[PDB]
Amino acid sequence: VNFNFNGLTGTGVLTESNKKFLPFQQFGRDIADTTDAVRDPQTLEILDITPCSFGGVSVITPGTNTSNQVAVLYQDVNCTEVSNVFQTRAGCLIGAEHVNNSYECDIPIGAGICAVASQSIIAYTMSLGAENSVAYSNNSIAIPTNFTISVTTEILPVSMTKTSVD
Protein backbone atom coordinates (compact mmCIF):
# COMPACT_ATOMS: atom_id res chain seq x y z
CA VAL A 1 0.00 0.00 0.00
CA ASN A 2 1.19 3.51 -0.76
CA PHE A 3 0.62 5.61 2.33
CA ASN A 4 0.73 9.18 3.62
CA PHE A 5 1.33 8.96 7.37
CA ASN A 6 0.94 12.59 8.54
CA GLY A 7 3.40 13.92 5.95
CA LEU A 8 5.64 10.94 5.24
CA THR A 9 5.20 9.29 1.84
CA GLY A 10 6.10 5.73 0.97
CA THR A 11 4.94 2.30 -0.11
CA GLY A 12 5.07 -0.97 1.79
CA VAL A 13 3.31 -3.41 4.10
CA LEU A 14 2.14 -2.00 7.44
CA THR A 15 2.63 -4.86 9.88
CA GLU A 16 1.74 -4.83 13.59
CA SER A 17 5.04 -5.96 15.11
CA ASN A 18 5.62 -5.06 18.75
CA LYS A 19 7.72 -2.01 19.64
CA LYS A 20 7.74 0.52 22.47
CA PHE A 21 7.58 4.21 21.54
CA LEU A 22 8.41 6.97 23.99
CA PRO A 23 5.62 9.57 24.24
CA PHE A 24 7.72 12.33 22.64
CA GLN A 25 8.94 10.04 19.82
CA GLN A 26 6.73 9.84 16.74
CA PHE A 27 8.53 7.32 14.54
CA GLY A 28 11.65 5.19 14.23
CA ARG A 29 14.46 5.09 11.69
CA ASP A 30 16.96 2.60 10.32
CA ILE A 31 20.64 3.21 9.50
CA ALA A 32 19.58 5.29 6.50
CA ASP A 33 16.79 7.88 6.58
CA THR A 34 14.11 5.27 5.85
CA THR A 35 11.49 5.06 8.59
CA ASP A 36 11.16 1.42 9.63
CA ALA A 37 8.54 2.13 12.31
CA VAL A 38 5.81 4.78 12.39
CA ARG A 39 3.21 5.29 15.11
CA ASP A 40 -0.24 5.34 13.52
CA PRO A 41 -2.19 8.51 14.41
CA GLN A 42 -5.67 8.14 15.93
CA THR A 43 -4.53 4.78 17.32
CA LEU A 44 -0.93 5.24 18.59
CA GLU A 45 -0.29 1.73 17.26
CA ILE A 46 3.10 0.46 16.11
CA LEU A 47 3.46 -0.34 12.41
CA ASP A 48 6.78 -1.66 11.09
CA ILE A 49 7.03 -0.35 7.53
CA THR A 50 8.53 -3.08 5.35
CA PRO A 51 9.37 -2.61 1.65
CA CYS A 52 7.37 -4.56 -0.90
CA SER A 53 8.56 -7.91 -2.29
CA PHE A 54 10.60 -6.37 -5.08
CA GLY A 55 13.39 -8.12 -6.91
CA GLY A 56 15.18 -8.43 -10.19
CA VAL A 57 13.67 -10.17 -13.20
CA SER A 58 15.68 -12.59 -15.33
CA VAL A 59 14.84 -14.47 -18.53
CA ILE A 60 15.45 -18.15 -19.26
CA THR A 61 15.63 -18.28 -23.05
CA PRO A 62 17.30 -21.11 -25.01
CA GLY A 63 18.28 -18.95 -27.98
CA THR A 64 16.13 -17.66 -30.84
CA ASN A 65 18.12 -19.83 -33.26
CA THR A 66 16.99 -22.87 -31.23
CA SER A 67 13.57 -22.05 -29.75
CA ASN A 68 11.35 -19.16 -28.66
CA GLN A 69 9.79 -20.28 -25.36
CA VAL A 70 10.47 -17.75 -22.59
CA ALA A 71 10.62 -18.46 -18.85
CA VAL A 72 10.55 -15.13 -17.03
CA LEU A 73 12.10 -15.19 -13.56
CA TYR A 74 11.08 -13.70 -10.21
CA GLN A 75 14.00 -13.81 -7.77
CA ASP A 76 13.99 -13.21 -4.00
CA VAL A 77 10.14 -13.10 -4.10
CA ASN A 78 7.51 -15.56 -2.71
CA CYS A 79 5.17 -16.25 -5.65
CA THR A 80 2.19 -16.25 -3.32
CA GLU A 81 1.78 -12.75 -4.79
CA VAL A 82 2.19 -12.33 -8.55
CA SER A 83 2.61 -21.55 -16.76
CA ASN A 84 3.56 -23.86 -13.90
CA VAL A 85 5.12 -21.92 -11.02
CA PHE A 86 8.11 -23.30 -9.11
CA GLN A 87 9.73 -21.88 -5.97
CA THR A 88 13.33 -22.00 -4.75
CA ARG A 89 15.69 -20.13 -2.43
CA ALA A 90 16.73 -17.68 -5.16
CA GLY A 91 13.08 -16.91 -5.89
CA CYS A 92 9.96 -18.33 -7.48
CA LEU A 93 10.43 -19.19 -11.16
CA ILE A 94 7.53 -19.38 -13.61
CA GLY A 95 7.55 -20.73 -17.13
CA ALA A 96 9.42 -23.85 -16.00
CA GLU A 97 8.70 -27.15 -14.27
CA HIS A 98 10.85 -28.86 -11.64
CA VAL A 99 12.16 -32.34 -12.42
CA ASN A 100 13.53 -34.86 -9.93
CA ASN A 101 16.28 -36.09 -12.27
CA SER A 102 19.66 -34.38 -12.04
CA TYR A 103 20.68 -32.41 -15.14
CA GLU A 104 23.83 -30.43 -15.89
CA CYS A 105 23.61 -26.68 -15.39
CA ASP A 106 22.95 -24.82 -18.65
CA ILE A 107 21.19 -21.62 -17.54
CA PRO A 108 21.93 -21.02 -13.84
CA ILE A 109 19.02 -19.34 -12.05
CA GLY A 110 20.49 -19.12 -8.55
CA ALA A 111 20.66 -21.14 -5.34
CA GLY A 112 21.42 -24.34 -7.23
CA ILE A 113 18.55 -24.12 -9.73
CA CYS A 114 19.59 -24.55 -13.37
CA ALA A 115 17.61 -24.84 -16.58
CA VAL A 116 14.40 -25.64 -23.63
CA ALA A 117 14.38 -29.43 -23.22
CA SER A 118 11.89 -31.59 -25.15
CA GLN A 119 9.71 -28.65 -26.29
CA SER A 120 9.60 -27.36 -22.71
CA ILE A 121 11.64 -25.27 -20.28
CA ILE A 122 12.71 -27.04 -17.09
CA ALA A 123 14.22 -25.88 -13.80
CA TYR A 124 16.01 -28.71 -12.00
CA THR A 125 18.41 -29.20 -9.14
CA MET A 126 21.92 -28.78 -10.52
CA SER A 127 23.68 -32.06 -11.28
CA LEU A 128 27.15 -31.52 -9.82
CA GLY A 129 28.35 -34.27 -12.16
CA ALA A 130 28.41 -38.03 -12.26
CA GLU A 131 28.39 -39.22 -8.64
CA ASN A 132 31.51 -41.30 -9.19
CA SER A 133 31.88 -43.00 -5.83
CA VAL A 134 35.45 -44.20 -6.34
CA ALA A 135 35.92 -47.61 -4.72
CA TYR A 136 38.68 -46.77 -2.29
CA SER A 137 40.33 -49.53 -0.29
CA ASN A 138 43.44 -49.88 1.84
CA ASN A 139 44.93 -52.10 -0.89
CA SER A 140 43.27 -50.77 -4.06
CA ILE A 141 45.32 -49.13 -6.82
CA ALA A 142 44.30 -47.89 -10.27
CA ILE A 143 46.89 -47.72 -13.05
CA PRO A 144 46.16 -46.20 -16.49
CA THR A 145 47.24 -48.54 -19.32
CA ASN A 146 47.00 -45.73 -21.92
CA PHE A 147 46.72 -41.93 -22.37
CA THR A 148 45.52 -39.10 -24.64
CA ILE A 149 47.74 -36.34 -26.01
CA SER A 150 45.05 -33.64 -26.09
CA VAL A 151 45.88 -30.04 -27.02
CA THR A 152 43.64 -28.12 -24.65
CA THR A 153 43.45 -24.58 -26.04
CA GLU A 154 43.20 -21.72 -23.55
CA ILE A 155 43.11 -18.10 -24.70
CA LEU A 156 44.54 -15.16 -22.76
CA PRO A 157 43.96 -11.48 -23.60
CA VAL A 158 47.50 -10.12 -23.57
CA SER A 159 47.10 -6.64 -25.06
CA MET A 160 43.87 -4.73 -25.55
CA THR A 161 43.54 -2.13 -28.28
CA LYS A 162 45.94 0.71 -27.45
CA THR A 163 43.21 3.32 -27.17
CA SER A 164 44.72 6.79 -26.85
CA VAL A 165 41.79 9.16 -26.32
CA ASP A 166 43.44 12.59 -26.41
Binding site: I141, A142, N146, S150, E154, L156, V158, S159
Partner: peptide, 18 residues
Protein backbone atom coordinates in the same frame (compact mmCIF):
# COMPACT_ATOMS: atom_id res chain seq x y z
CA UNK B 1 45.00 -8.66 -29.28
CA UNK B 2 45.94 -11.70 -27.24
CA UNK B 3 47.54 -15.12 -27.54
CA UNK B 4 46.46 -18.76 -27.83
CA UNK B 5 48.38 -21.65 -26.29
CA UNK B 6 47.94 -25.15 -27.71
CA UNK B 7 48.72 -26.75 -24.36
CA UNK B 8 49.89 -30.23 -25.26
CA UNK B 9 49.04 -32.38 -22.25
CA UNK B 10 49.39 -36.01 -21.18
CA UNK B 11 45.94 -37.10 -19.99
CA UNK B 12 45.81 -40.79 -18.95
CA UNK B 13 42.93 -43.09 -19.81
CA UNK B 14 41.87 -46.77 -19.74
CA UNK B 15 42.55 -47.30 -16.00
CA UNK B 16 42.91 -50.87 -14.65
CA UNK B 17 42.49 -51.72 -10.94
CA UNK B 18 45.24 -53.83 -9.25
Amino acid sequence: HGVVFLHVTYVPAQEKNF
